[PDB]
Design a protein around this ligand. Structure first.
Ligand SMILES: [Zn+2]
Ligand SMILES: [Zn+2]
Ligand SMILES: [Zn+2]
Ligand SMILES: [Zn+2]
Lengths: 219, 219
């Protein structure tokens, strides 16, 4: 397919996007981040394939960055396809404990590190992880980047180009709006929200997601 | 997945819709028609799977209709997945000659009947087939239903919910707008346009498709 794209979206923050080209629909995209702490790089969600993960690692190496770890924000392949490769390179991989268990239940490679806590931090205080409750999946977490004022909402949040919730096979639709409201309750001074699929937007992605969740739940 | 849906959209015309549920995106739909001439039924595009084709044939049998033939509007699986089943039941299957050759090149079941003509008619004059030129694929054809004033645009036309051309792996983007203009030149008194994917709309689907094609071609 179309290979990995990596673009800068803030000082020390890059959006990585990988793709699948589906007959019947067309190109589907999948986003994660690279977050820098000086020269130390943290991967928030792997690309959607092992090959695209290799491209992301090469992207870092070519530019002199040192990849420290990855965190995956739920167990789906579009968040985790690269865990196997990172493990083979002795790069620490993280998920929540529930995500780890879900991966093992799917017969997929597990992270080398995991936490059973609603909050966890990577780097300085560079990346603040939070579990707001079930939505897109039972295990979805989000990441707040206090320096850049970016919330990585992952697949729990929906870009404005979408008029529905996306893939809901593993979703808890009746809990989804409440889980977004829990994010809102954190009172992050959000300047940008990055979704797992679709275009980056502003804080109103949260409101849009609540609208979509409440509509689908009442249906 | 979610099984076949069949709903009436005009006197003697039914929309059949089949689905695939994709992680990373969600539910993708695929449309065809059943067109009646008294009790004689014509299938414009098969459902997206053999199993959904069996459901469509059962739908017809249960309601007393006699399925006479199918026509597929290009070679992609979402138009043709049911050809094998119809052939096994000695129900005539049609495509254009180019579509037939493309199917054989993909190692897929071929229709039992085919024409190398820009126009062809099924039933009364019930269904008027036209090849307007390359767009979504090299072989795409459309169907005009003069009694119901419906143009089945198939995957060559794009519903208003889409802001792009969809799957373009086999497309001729530089010819697409011209091909729509050829449809316009037929001067069909169009009341409804049915796309291969997405929601049924009005004649302005043609204009929308031209806009999308011209934008993509200039890019
Ligand atoms: Zn997911
Ligand atoms: Zn996702
Ligand atoms: Zn097609
Ligand atoms: Zn199609």
């Amino acid at each position: 397919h179309k290979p990995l794209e990596v673009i800068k979206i803030e000082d020390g923050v890059y959006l990585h996007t990988s793709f699948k080209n589906i007959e019947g629909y067309g190109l589907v995209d999948s986003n994660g981040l690279v977050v820098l702490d000086n020269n130390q790089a943290y991967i928030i969600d792997t690309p959607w394939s092992e090959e695209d993960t290799k491209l992301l690692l090469s992207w870092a190496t070519d530019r002199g960055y040192q990849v420290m770890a990855s965190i995956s924000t739920h167990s789906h392949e579009d968040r985790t396809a690269g865990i196997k490769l990172l493990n083979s390179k002795s790069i620490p991989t993280y998920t929540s404990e529930l995500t780890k268990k879900l991966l093992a239940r799917e017969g997929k490679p597990v992270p080398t590190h995991y936490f059973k806590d609603d909050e966890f931090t990577l780097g300085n205080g560079l990346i603040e992880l939070y579990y707001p409750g079930a939505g897109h999946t039972e295990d979805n977490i989000v990441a707040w980047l206090p320096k850049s004022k970016i919330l990585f909402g992952g697949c729990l949040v929906r870009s404005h180009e979408w008029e529905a919730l996306g893939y809901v096979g593993d979703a808890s639709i009746s809990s989804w709006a409440d889980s977004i409201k829990n994010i809102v309750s954190k009172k992050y001074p959000i300047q940008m929200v990055v979704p797992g699929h679709g275009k980056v937007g502003s804080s109103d992605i949260l409101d849009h997601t609540i609208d979509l969740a409440e509509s689908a739940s009442n249906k």
